Design a protein around this ligand. Sequence first.
Ligand code: CLA
Ligand code: CLA
Ligand code: CLA
Ligand SMILES: CCCCCCCCCCCCCCCCCC(=O)OC[C@H](CO)OC(=O)CCCCCCCCCCCCCCCCC
Ligand SMILES: CC1=C(/C=C/C(C)=C/C=C/C(C)=C/C=C/C=C(C)/C=C/C=C(C)/C=C/C2=C(C)CCCC2(C)C)C(C)(C)CCC1
Ligand SMILES: CC1=C(/C=C/C(C)=C/C=C/C(C)=C/C=C/C=C(C)/C=C/C=C(C)/C=C/C2=C(C)CCCC2(C)C)C(C)(C)CCC1
Ligand SMILES: [Cl-]
Ligand SMILES: [Cl-]
Ligand code: NA
Lengths: 243, 37, 449, 35, 76, 336, 61, 32, 44, 36
Amino acid sequence: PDLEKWYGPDRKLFLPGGLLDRDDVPEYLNGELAGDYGYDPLGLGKDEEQVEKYRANELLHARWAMLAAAGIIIPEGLQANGADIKGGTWFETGAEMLNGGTLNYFAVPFGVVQNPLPLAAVTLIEIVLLGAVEKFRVDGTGPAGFSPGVGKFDSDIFDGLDKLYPGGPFDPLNLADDPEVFAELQVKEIKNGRLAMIAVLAFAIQSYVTGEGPYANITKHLSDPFGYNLLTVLQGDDRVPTL
Amino acid sequence: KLPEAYAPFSPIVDVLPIIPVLFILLAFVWQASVSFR
Amino acid sequence: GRDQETTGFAWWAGNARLINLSGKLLGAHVAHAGLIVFWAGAMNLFEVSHFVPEKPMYEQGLILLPHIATLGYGVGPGGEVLDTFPYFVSGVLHLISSAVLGFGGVYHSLIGPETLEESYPFFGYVWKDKNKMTNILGYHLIILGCGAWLLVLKALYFGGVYDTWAPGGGDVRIISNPTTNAAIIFGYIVKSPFGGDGWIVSVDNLEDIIGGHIWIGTLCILGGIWHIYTTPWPWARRAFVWSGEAYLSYSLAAVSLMGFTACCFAWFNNTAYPSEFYGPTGPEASQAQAFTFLVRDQRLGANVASAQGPTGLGKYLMRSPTGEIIFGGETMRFWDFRGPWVEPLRGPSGLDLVKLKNDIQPWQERRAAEYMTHAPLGSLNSVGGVATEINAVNFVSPRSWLATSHFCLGFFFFVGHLWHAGRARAAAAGFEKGIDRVDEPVLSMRPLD
Amino acid sequence: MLTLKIFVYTVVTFFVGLFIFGFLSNDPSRNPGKG
Amino acid sequence: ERPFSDILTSIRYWVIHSITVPSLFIAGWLFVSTGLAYDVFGSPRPNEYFTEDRQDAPLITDRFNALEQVKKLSAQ
Amino acid sequence: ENTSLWARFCEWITSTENRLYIGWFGVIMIPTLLTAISVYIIAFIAAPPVDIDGIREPVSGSLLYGNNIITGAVVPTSNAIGLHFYPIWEAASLDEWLYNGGPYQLVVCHFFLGVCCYMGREWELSYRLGMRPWIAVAYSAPVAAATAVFIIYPIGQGSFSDGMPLGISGTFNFMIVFQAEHNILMHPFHMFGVAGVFGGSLFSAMHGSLVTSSLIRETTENESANAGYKFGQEEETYNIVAAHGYFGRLIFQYASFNNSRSLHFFLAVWPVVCIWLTALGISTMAFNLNGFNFNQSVVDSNGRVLNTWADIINRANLGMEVMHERNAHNFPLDLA
Amino acid sequence: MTSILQIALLGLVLVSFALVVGVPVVFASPNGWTENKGVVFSGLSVWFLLVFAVGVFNSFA
Amino acid sequence: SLTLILQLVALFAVVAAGPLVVVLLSVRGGNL
Amino acid sequence: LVDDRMNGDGTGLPFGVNDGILGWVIAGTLGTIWAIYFVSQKDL
Amino acid sequence: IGRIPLWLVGTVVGLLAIGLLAIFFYGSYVGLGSSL
Ligand code: CLA
Ligand code: CLA
Ligand code: CLA
Ligand SMILES: CCCCCCCCCCCCCCCCCC(=O)OC[C@H](CO)OC(=O)CCCCCCCCCCCCCCCCC
Ligand SMILES: CC1=C(/C=C/C(C)=C/C=C/C(C)=C/C=C/C=C(C)/C=C/C=C(C)/C=C/C2=C(C)CCCC2(C)C)C(C)(C)CCC1
Ligand SMILES: CC1=C(/C=C/C(C)=C/C=C/C(C)=C/C=C/C=C(C)/C=C/C=C(C)/C=C/C2=C(C)CCCC2(C)C)C(C)(C)CCC1
Ligand SMILES: [Cl-]
Ligand SMILES: [Cl-]
Ligand code: NA
């Protein structure tokens, strides 16, 4: 694992060598964390500790957006290709459970199952589960065990587990015991998460502009690239020819 | 004709194709300025 | 920059000074590519600004708008222009991209690293590094295959391209079922280049064109992967010369051949170069004159089958050396011409007599008269017609302009190939600067030459 | 005529093959230069 | 003497010639525009190639009275 | 001891001890040129008349059919054939092949291959002798001119009947019809070619006269001055400084060629580039781009055409045009 | 909206001319590139912004 | 005319651009 | 017809091969020269 | 004396020569001898 492209002084930066000499990079970015491209034009970091807690926020947003990008794009594609999914378009899935409505959960590839849980039960379950999980995350303590690989673990294995990267229960497939590949996978994780965050922001803006989901956007744009793009949807109607 | 919003820029459109001819002459100017070093 | 004292090259050979400077050579290349895209965009914007809708493109001295129209933008049935905004967008996109390419070229020429070998080993190269040379060649082959596949995608799914052979006088068509048969595709590359065969210029249908482009794209991608993952074999390493000038000479020979071929495409092909946009070919104009003087005298009651000229061959109709019924006169030399306005009139034996008597369409008559009056004959100050005609009309065919310019370019690039191949051999052998005057080979040879 | 065509094809193929494999036969080494 | 590059790169030369050269250019322009070129060299103006008498090209057929022949066949 | 058959053959082919160098370009050059020479000589002596215009009206061409050396020619291929590649085996009989102009295509194709391989052979011998390689580049200009008149112009015109006839009066016919149809005299590329041949004559005479003028005294008056030069002498046989001084005092002390290498480069480059230009002019007029058309350019105030020397040339070209191929045209426009 | 596009395109022409005259000057100036980084980056950024703005305003004009 | 005047202004600007760059690099340091 | 001819003109004929014996003699001659060059290589 | 650069002098002279030649070519299409 060539770790020197991501950590240390001779790492990859957000501008190339001719555009950015390695003297304008801020001193608090010296290649100690994954995804360090020396990118801080506005002085929002100001020191290593503030950069570290901002990295906590960045990694949490990255993981949530990595889940969210798949959760946005996949049900819409399944519905468009012919699955019995309602509310596949991500911004109109909420209304589908408004007037006592329900959803269909398509367990791939096994089939669509009708979901009996109503909106109130769903939101109560989400509130209690997410509150408990976030409280466990900030406290560093958890009640029960049985994660794969590590097995049934007592409620004390969480001590010494690093925040944002706790091994043991959250690592059933190992894949990270070697520190070099662990750091390299940290770089991969943060880059994928940044890409997913930008993708989710793109999903939101495209959905607001075009009134349709990102799968519809990409499919219609690949159907006709020069007849369906941002400028074409801003134009509104067919342009009067300049003949 | 150009599109109506771009019609007032037709005079500068009509000059552009000679700029590649101007580049080789600029190379000769630069070589003369370095005294054909 | 550098002087002659440190390089051994005078200013008029100053580009040779950057043969072994990878970064500056890259900068020269990128600035040059910016120049090419600049000319494309600027000339396209000039042509659309000077474009006049009622006249056909070939009457207006346009060479790029016919290319985009053949791609199938802004035109309808019969080659009639419906919108010039696609042409304007093409010009604008090229002109803007030329700025980015020019910035990159100027950067790498002036303040970029002189050699890429130290800090950028992926881009660093020496000319004798045959593996790196094949890697770069493979990358470029992959890019070219993707460009050919872009043409295929435009033809199949993105609006199609202009088919001049569509019934009713051509239209923009979706190409379904391209000719992927290897026998049909490579027959063109093994055809004779002479009359009646025409080598690859005689490709006459969009199905054949797009199938050949599928073949070219797939072969270019496969060869690109091949060259990325292989090293030249010992027979190649003994046959070739491995230096930048030698590679340049190989490319010069290849593009000289391409320029001559493009000349012949522009002069002869009316499928990839539709006559609606490029004007008639020379054979097309001669056959159109013959057809027009046939239909006029048919309308005057004359029998165009029994009429013989002063020589006795036949004023309107005669036979090709293989027996086909063809138009009479000197245009017999163009008897192998095929065009969308004449092929409905041809049965198995050639020009069908009853079809010429009863089945002549008004659009065919109009195209024939137009192509007769707009033959690719004119002066270089753009006076249309033969050298004896007076200065009345302002017309030179785009086919004539393209053919003349590209024959000239092909010839000069053949000469440049000769120059650089000879100099590459002499420099590899070590006597490109002259005879040593102390170890002269001829003085060591047996006399009597 | 077909006999003549066969003979001419054989002759042209023979001379072209001689040309091709002659320049394939280590031709850049056939010079009096040093290096 | 002076090796003519020193001449071509001297402000004295250029302050003389920024006056002399444009004056000669303007003199030539005035020579054509004022009709003095036509008067001096006898070239007909575009309106006086043909007269009311002859509507074809002139033809000098006399040698020893060619002066008055060209005087009467010219533009008066 | 290098007993291999192909190795022995290759060492003989690339041998610099042969009286005439063969090389791998020569193994294509010698058979094609021998074929072209044989067919040209046989056809020029005894070929039957050729229906050049395709109008069943043959042109004799050969000595045995009543031509002299000036009027004798190998007549171009029939217009009915056009560009369709007519070899002997594509003819029903040798008589038909002769009637239709087959010898012309045979000689032209073999001559083109032979001169291309002659240029390659020039490069090859320069390489085997340790020379610089650009004599082939210099020879590319007559090769371009021959290709233009024998191949490129028939390609652009659609028929090998428009090739230059292999003869003297045939060459004159080609020139006259070419001027009639394209106004080659008013073509700038042809003007450059004329400047090149005139300048080549001027510069050959000038350089030879200067070298002969500055020859150093090594002989006597009873002996030829050429005897003052010995083949392979190390020292210079003439005074370059004196010749340059005379030239500078003659026209301008500047704008000279005191560098002998620069002088010889100029002597090489001027006629070669100008012949390149005029060969390209022929090749462009193959696609009907033509010379400057200044017919009726000058009009008076009332619009009457004032004829010029270009208009007199146009009258001459009209006389040339209305008389060439007097029975071959059925329609007014000479598009083909 | 047409006047806004015309003003934006005029500004793009002016910025393009400024970049054409200045970027080679800054590049080949002695220590000019290491000092005019901000000015050159501002010019390139405003050039890209003007190009995108003209492209957007074309759909409304 | 306004079209001819604007064409002349653009022509003079583009013609003077490159020479101005060379002149500015000559008087402002060097490295040309 | 009054006489026989090959009638190979035009028709887009691969290498002008109207009879497979022509392709065979081309392949045989090229392969014979190649075989001589190949069994005669590594001899310089 | 060399106060003005010779390359600048030659560039201005060539610019005027190119301008005069462009004027001459423009006059081929207008005025006298323009076929109009
Ligand atoms: C033939 C093209 C080419 C090549 C091989 C290189 C190669 C290189 N450049 Mg680059 N350069 C180019 C074009 C090229 N340049 C262009 C057009 C620009 C203008 C944007 C620049 C401006 C530039 C700068 C300012 C810098 C480099 C530098 C570098 C070095 C490494 C950084 C890098 O990859 O660039 C980074 C370039 C980008 C991130 C631009 C995006 C490129 C993506 C990958 C597009 C891929 C192409 C894609 C197929 C579309 C093709 C477009 C085509 C059809 C026109 C390396 C020597 C650096 C250097 O020398 O450091 C000392 C440096 O500082 N380049
Ligand atoms: C793909 C194109 C290509 C490439 C990349 C190069 C690259 C190289 N060549 Mg060149 N060359 C080529 C094509 C190519 N050439 C062709 C087509 C010819 C002409 C037949 C030659 C002839 C040639 C010569 C004779 C020599 C070079 C040399 C060189 C080197 C220095 C070039 C230099 O500093 O010129 C600087 C640029 C100039 C001096 C400008 C020349 C002015 C030209 C003629 C203007 C023409 C404009 C005209 C209007 C165009 C239209 C004409 C016609 C088509 C209508 C360089 C490595 C030199 C060498 O061997 O170095 C090792 C050398 O002496 N080349
Ligand atoms: C297609 C044109 C082309 C290209 C791209 C190049 C490229 C190159 N040449 Mg050049 N050159 C050319 C043709 C070309 N040349 C011709 C026609 C000649 C004959 C006169 C030569 C003869 C020649 C010599 C004699 C030498 C080179 C050298 C150089 C290299 C160094 C540049 C340098 O230091 O200049 C410095 C120049 C300047 C500082 C002044 C010009 C500044 C820029 C480039 C002007 C561009 C303006 C442009 C519109 C700005 C765009 C901005 C962008 C944001 C859009 C450079 C890569 C040198 C070399 O080998 O380097 C080691 C060298 O010694 N050239
Ligand atoms: C009209 C019919 C003819 C069709 C024309 C096209 C045929 C396909 C030719 C493509 C050859 C591809 C280039 C391979 C390398 C060439 C240089 C070389 O050779 O480099 C040499 C290299 C050195 O080892 O060899 C090697 O790497 C091995 C290279 C393999 C050589 C191919 C030979 C195939 C079989 C030949 C005929 C069978 C011959 C037997 C005839 C004997 C008498 C009857
Ligand atoms: C290296 C070098 C060189 C070269 C250089 C180059 C080549 C450069 C370039 C460059 C380039 C290649 C550039 C480009 C550019 C572009 C631009 C700058 C643009 C733009 C834009 C605009 C502004 C536009 C606008 C418009 C539109 C949009 C449409 C309408 C009209 C108008 C026009 C208005 C030389 C030789 C000199 C010398 C040596 C060095
Ligand atoms: C797209 C298209 C198409 C397709 C095409 C194609 C498919 C092409 C191709 C092609 C190819 C596939 C080609 C190839 C080629 C080859 C060549 C061109 C060659 C070569 C080479 C050389 C020249 C060599 C030399 C040598 C020798 C002889 C020996 C010694 C050494 C050396 C190597 C040097 C078609 C027409 C259908 C249609 C239209 C369009
Ligand atoms: Cl005649
Ligand atoms: Cl006729
Ligand atoms: Na006649």
